[PDB]
Amino acid sequence: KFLPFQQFGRDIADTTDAVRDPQTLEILDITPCSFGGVSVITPGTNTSN
Amino acid sequence: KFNGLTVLPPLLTDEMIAQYTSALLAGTITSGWTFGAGPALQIPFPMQMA
Ligand SMILES: *[C@@H]1O[C@H](CO)[C@@H](O)[C@H](O)[C@H]1NC(C)=O
Numbered sequence: 001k002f003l004p005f006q007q008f009g010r011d012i013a014d015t016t017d018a019v020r021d022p023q024t025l026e027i028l029d030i031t032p033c034s035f036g037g038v039s040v041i042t043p044g045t046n047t048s049n
Numbered sequence: 050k051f052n053g054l055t056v057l058p059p060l061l062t063d064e065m066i067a068q069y070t071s072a073l074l075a076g077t078i079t080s081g082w083t084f085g086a087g088p089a090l091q092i093p094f095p096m097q098m099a
Pocket residue numbers: 045046047
C-alpha cells in the first residue's frame with residue numbers, strides 16, 4: 001500500500017510498482033526469478049561416470 | 050534477496066549440533082573424562098566429582 005501520489009518504490013536498490021501509464025495504474029512487484037549457481041557431485045572420474 | 054548475492058546453508062544444521070552437544074554432555078556426566086580417551090567407562094557422578 002503506497003500513498004496515492006508516488007510512482008516508484010525501492011528499499012535498497014529497486015522494487016518499483018504502479019503502472020506508469022496516465023490511462024491506468026496497477027501495482028506490480030519487482031523481484032528476480034530464482035537465479036543461482038550449479039554444482040555437480042562426482043565420486044571420481046576413475047571410479048564411475 | 051538481492052542481485053548477485055546468495056547465502057549457503059550450513060553443512061551441519063542446528064539439530065545435529067544440538068545432538069553433538071547432548072552427546073558430549075551425556076559422556077561427560079556418565080563417564081567423566083574417560084570417553085574422550087578411548088572407550089567410555091561408566092562411573093557414578095559423586096565418585097567422579099570426588
Ligand atoms: C584412478 O585409479 C586408477 C586405478 O587405481 C589409477 O591408475 C589412476 O592413477 C587413478 N587416477 C586417475 C586420474 O585415473
